[PDB]
From a paper:
To determine the structure of FucA1, we performed single-particle cryo-EM using a 200 kV Thermo Fisher Scientific Glacios electron cryo-microscope equipped with a Falcon-4 detector. Micrographs showed particles with diverse angular coverage, and secondary structural features could be observed in two-dimensional (2D) class averages. Further data processing resulted in a 3D reconstruction of FucA1 with dihedral symmetry (D2) and an overall resolution of 2.49 Å. FucA1 forms a symmetric homotetramer approximately 150 × 100 × 40 Å in size. Each protomer interacts with two other protomers through residues in both the catalytic and β-sandwich domains, including the loop between residues 441 and 451, thus creating a flattened quaternary structure. We also observed cryo-EM density corresponding to one of the three predicted glycosylation sites. Many of the most frequent natural variants are present on external loops and α-helices; no active-site residues have any natural variation, and very few variants are present on the β-barrel core of the catalytic domain. Surprisingly, none of the missense mutations identified in cases of fucosidosis are present in the active site. The six known missense mutations represent either the shift from a non-polar residue to a charged residue in the protein’s interior (G60D, G340E, L405R) or a disruption of the hydrogen-bonding network of a polar residue by replacement with a non-polar/aromatic residue (S63L, S150F, N329Y).
In humans, the dynamic process of α-L-fucose removal is catalyzed by two α-L-fucosidases—lysosomal FucA1 and secreted FucA2—both of which liberate α-L-fucose from fucosylated glycoconjugates. Here, we have used cryoelectron microscopy (cryo-EM) to determine the structure of human lysosomal α-L-fucosidase (FucA1) in both an unliganded state and in complex with the inhibitor deoxyfuconojirimycin. These structures, determined at 2.49 Å resolution, reveal the homotetrameric structure of FucA1, the architecture of the catalytic center, and the location of both natural population variations and disease-causing mutations. Each protomer of FucA1 is comprised of an N-terminal catalytic domain—a modified (β/α)8 barrel—and a C-terminal β-sandwich domain, which are characteristic of GH29 enzymes (Lombard et al., 2014).
Author numbering:
A (entry chain D), B (entry chain A), C (entry chain C), D (entry chain B): 31 to 461
The structure:
């Protein structure tokens, strides 16, 4: 039992599935995919701020007087195949998939009763995208997360509440709470990814009451996790796990379960038609951030943006499949692992540490030129074995008294290494 | 002061402007003008009943999966000129203009806060049609009426209330009452034309409370009139004036102020692109219904349907201008008139009676072949004068003792009569 | 046998069907119906001259960079019913119908082999409009005329010929002659209405050779008529009949068969969406021009403009049906008639004269106030009878020695006259 | 001087630029990019053969009656930046770029006088794509090739010629020859890539006369090359160089200059919106085919398909940039090289031979596991040096008397090799 206050809500232990999942896939999909230009913040940058480049794009691409709601019918999504998406996510090694159900534009990706003619069923796809994706993911035993944005940029009731100093709660009682309850009662989410909370306190958003209901009387009360974006000054302070800031890259080990959210497109979470090759994050950088995040006790949430036709572009597929290929070899050092006592060597070639049971995994991203890996932190016992995940056969190792351990790496010819950018050394019987 | 009950509300006397206005113009305009096929009931006939002809039209005219909300962006209304509309309505002799602010499709023709992205400001015209038309009409001193449909066919909250036996009032508190209050507080209507009430009792619609507020604390509390469509079994029983049934044609004189609503297009209140010439009501039939309605103490509300571009087609303009030309001659027998003691001769060639002050007007629609008009009802005094509105000069008349009065009509050559289908005889000093 | 020179071609007698037809209907239909703004000269006024109003219309109604060819796919014509058109034309009293097969825009309304992807079959309607209309008209025994514009404003080959001083004939051999031969060999026209000839001499257009082929070896060599627009300085000088100038209104009787072409819309031959009621020619003015044209030995060609959906608007239907109603009464004074020796009274109330056999018809457009019609021209014999077409029964008439004939008109009550704007007096046994 | 016959035309020596260019980029771009489904043969597969899948796609994606020409206005190409394209092609190492000016659909990508309203200037892009791309490529000193398809699937004149047994030449004189002359006189192509010739003999296509004019009196008569697709049975028999069959992979060394044309998308030369990652040719396979083609004395033409918006998708950019990165290291073994006397080792790990001057390059695609490369073919002299292109420093080598040469490869650690899939050994002073 939990009471509608933060000290009680924060005492709820997180279900173990989230910490054992490690890797997840983020999907930013909505009406902003129709312009597919700039970012998913298109509407705010165009009308909220009146940026000249967005106005020029609107002038040169659409008739005068074109409004954002006119994008609604053009969100056809006629090539949407949730089974293909789920197969790709399974091949990528993802253990959970978080889909944006409603972004700051206010367009719900499910038939919301309080979003009539501004949802995916009434206009655009004419489908229940949330339900179809959830069915496809549940058939493959992949955990489901629903991203929900609390605020809406131009919703009249939210604007009225903002004018009133957020003393009234017309928007919260009309749209926010009914939509959250509908999203929880149906589709039975495993994860809730809240957003759009930087403008109002948690008292206005009714976050504590909804969280108490979710933890007490909801159909998913047991195996559900939420992030920290439930109001002003609530980020990285209150909630299940801490997203804190976007693309969070902590230096030291945090004392709370956290998650890193990053996008393959470095300049937009939503799809961009004119994405350059230099705007796509490299597979070496993606695997590197994942290794650092898992080593520091965090979850890795990689974002892709589907097109307005419901397609995932081949470059995103290539990145995801490379991540999955790397994971098919090095998963036992990632999935259901916990941080070690050091988590990285401060004197070697970028070595990070994970631990599972009695096994210690050293994931290194740079192959030493001289062919011997130096590991100062591990303490060798008489039953120490080096494995080099992906290669059958033990490795030669010498324990220097004054210096650290020295592991003789297998000198493999080109086009024979198991992975291409990061390698894992497994140590058994090491303190 | 009025209480929220029908006996108190019905005791409010109607302001005299409505009874003195006589002639009004009805405007059915909305998203249904985009298909412009069948009727303004397109959405219900297509999805509510699944009529094969509407499905065939959708198949042959639009891509598969096309939804009604996809019509929203196509309601461009780029040729809308409210000043031209108001000038035409003034030329037609109309004293009040009633515009549909929101029909059963739920699309509001003003920026309604509770109709986000389903209003004329957010999608389609990108204008405030109600406000622009009201400004244009007020500049010309024409009374303004707002048509509001209580029900919406496919609104999720209305469907939920219908499923619950109309015991809940989610739709009323979410959409209906806020929209009515917004429509009254802004645009300050002179008339409220309610509709969409045949499915629910007046208790569900909160009609008595809204009417008490309108009559007590509203900005238009003095000079406002409402019709009788405020709930089930409320038509022709409760309200300001009685529309009763559409195209109401009573035989005897009603004891309550009433209004006849008729459409120039006999098969649709909304605009139809494939309107035939045989579907357009003739000017002789329009003038005839107006004369009968005014004689029987009623108001005449003639309906036109603008195109999705905001244009009134030349045939509707021709009908309205013919009605205005007839009124420029015979207005003093219509405007600010009251029914006489007979209201029609039961033995002559379709003669109807109006009265203003001491003057009695006999409007006849059939020119007698023999050239003498027989009037049994009037009682002639020694100061009796026959005028024949539109022609200067008295008329010869003989009072038969056993029979009635015989008026010698002016034998005019062709292309010399003032009007073309109905003529007015003015009698002064007649009991 | 005829030689390719004007003196030989002009000696061909016209088939009698054209002179006996009298009344015809002109149809201007094409891609210019899609903008439906300004006139059928939209493309030239917009790009040829760069008029600011057309550029403003393009800016406010279509995305930037929109070209005229982009109008092609929008010419859907999905409500085109040629049987309905032919029934309306039969009801209007039309004896021939002339349809624009290709205007100055170059868009052919039939599958022209030399107009690939710029014809009605390839884009837009996806139909053979010329063939369908011809089939519908031939089923009702209505004569068929094909309007063909020689020039095209922006065709590259025509522009090249114009640059070369019209010394080359690339456009004529590539487009003009093959299209004329295809239009004659198929659809077997009864009439050819040439246009677009004011820029080049008849030598450039190969007019004499095509006309010699048409009169010698064509499938319609016997019953075919052509107008006078076959080159520079060819109008009203060379050809079958003389259109001379548009809306030609001669004062005296011409010595050659001529035709008056006029449009119901006074400011456009093509359809205009924003047509005003004041822009529509009145039925009194239409009947008046027809009476004057037939009296002076001419044919009357009335023009209508269908919408881009293939619909004839109700106002055009009303005008045509009024003309047909007038003709159902006064046809025997029009069809297969010839001009008399006077053709109009120079001292009476606008009386025009036709003659058929021994019968002389006096069509008057103004009803005399005193009720007696004065006719100075006719010479009365002892077997003279006045008929007053539309009314059974002879008329009283007195022959003044010094003055002319005086006919006592029937004093009809209102709503009893046969026609409404023009009346015909039939005289038998009159010199 | 050359005469219009094949023995004279085939005797013309090819300019050296084509043989020294080696690597080129093919661009398939046109109206077929608008559907972006199936292949660039969309129109023929949909209407020519009536394949059920294409009909289903048309039914589910476009309104009924939609025609291929209706795709024309949708070819907006609003993100076309030829400078970016040329920069990418320069970065990819391409020495010539061949753009499709007109495919079998008949849509010309330049303002063709004989393709009015079916060209890129009149509809769609409203630009001269050929001219803009040519300007961008010429600024960077990249050779320009124009792909021209002789036949058009549904052009009426071509169909008429086919019906007549190709005895008439209406299509050739109306469209083919004028378009070829316009494409040569303007844009001054360096290469002509003919296609669409498998249906008619070279006599019908007038190929010999056009080629004699091109080689004698054209502005590009000196430095111009053409392929072998100039008529029936002309492929791989007549012309400048031999494309023979698409994706030609000869086993032995041909005796004539040839070119391999291959597409990154294995199932379409045109862009496909639903391209899968498995449909994209791998960079290892692309580099492998290029090495085999250059070794066997051929040119490598890699094809990409831009979107209807004028964009090259990031996966195509990645492939091209990987090819360019490989070439920045191994270019001196490719550019301006000639085949050696062996061209491949028949007993080693896929070694191919090129030669430049006195230097012999052995390009191997498989790294030997034991680290020593065996080369039987080369004959070692006392001044023999092994270089291993990309690595500074000679290599140890031992000449076995009975066996071949054995080169000690540099044992490089992972993430230190110059290339990733193919390596080049340079031998100096070797017979
Ligand atoms: C907040 O939640 C409480 C408890 O569930 C509820 O009673 C109240 O209606 C909610 N307030 C708003 C503004 O929705
Ligand atoms: C009905 O009106 C009353 C009195 O104004 C108000 O208190 C109540 O909220 C209304 N009920 C609904 C369902 O809107
Ligand atoms: C003109 O007609 C003549 C005679 O039919 C024909 O020989 C010639 O080809 C035509 N000229 C052009 C320019 O079409
Ligand atoms: C073929 O080329 C010859 C020589 O240039 C030319 O005279 C002839 O017109 C051409 N034939 C066709 C069918 O274009």
């Amino acid at each position: 039992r939990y009471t509608p206050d933060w000290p009680s809500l924060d005492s709820r232990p997180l279900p173990a599935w989230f910490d054992e999942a490690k890797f997840g896939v983020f999907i930013h999909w909505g009406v902003f995919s129709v312009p597919a230009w700039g970012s998913e913040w298109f509407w705010w940058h165009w009308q909220g701020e009146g940026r000249p480049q967005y106005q020029r794009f609107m002038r040169d691409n659409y008739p005068p007087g074109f409004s954002y709601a006119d994008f609604g019918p053009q969100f056809t999504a006629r090539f949407f195949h949730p089974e293909e998406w789920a197969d790709l996510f399974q091949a990528a090694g993802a253990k959970y998939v978080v889909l944006t159900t409603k972004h700051h534009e206010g367009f719900t990706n499910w038939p919301s009763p309080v979003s009539w003619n501004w949802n995916s069923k009434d206009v655009g796809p004419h489908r229940d995208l949330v339900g179809e994706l959830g069915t496809a993911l549940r058939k493959r035993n992949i955990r489901y997360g629903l991203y929900h944005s609390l605020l809406e940029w131009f919703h009249p009731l939210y604007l009225l509440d903002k004018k009133n100093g957020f003393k009234t709660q017309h928007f919260v009682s009309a749209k926010t709470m009914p939509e959250l309850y509908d999203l929880v009662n149906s589709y039975k989410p495993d994860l809730i990814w809240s957003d759009g909370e930087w403008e109002c306190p948690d008292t206005y958003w009714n976050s504590t009451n909804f969280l108490s209901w979710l933890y007490n009387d909801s159909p998913v009360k047991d195996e559900v996790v939420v992030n920290d974006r439930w109001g002003q000054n609530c980020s990285c302070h209150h909630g299940g796990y801490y997203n804190c800031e976007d693309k969070f890259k902590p230096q030291s080990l945090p004392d709370h379960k956290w998650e890193m959210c990053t996008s393959i497109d470095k300049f937009s979470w939503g799809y961009r038609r004119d994405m350059a090759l230099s705007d796509v994050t490299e597979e070496s950088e993606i695997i590197s951030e994942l290794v650092q995040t898992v080593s520091l006790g965090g979850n890795y949430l990689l974002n892709i943006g589907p097109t307005k036709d419901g397609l995932i572009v081949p470059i995103f597929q290539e990145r995801l499949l490379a991540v999955g290929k790397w994971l098919s070899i090095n998963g036992e050092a990632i999935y259901a692992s916990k941080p070690w006592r050091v988590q990285w060597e401060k004197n070697t070639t970028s070595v990070w540490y994970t631990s599972k049971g009695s096994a210690v995994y050293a994931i290194f991203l740079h192959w030493p030129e001289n062919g011997v890996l130096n590991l100062e932190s591990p303490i060798t016992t008489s039953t120490t074995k080096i494995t080099m995940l992906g290669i059958q056969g033990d490795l030669k190792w010498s324990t220097d008294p004054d210096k650290g351990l020295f592991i003789s790496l297998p000198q493999l010819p080109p086009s024979a290494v198991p992975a291409e950018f990061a390698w894992t050394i497994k140590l058994t019987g090491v303190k």
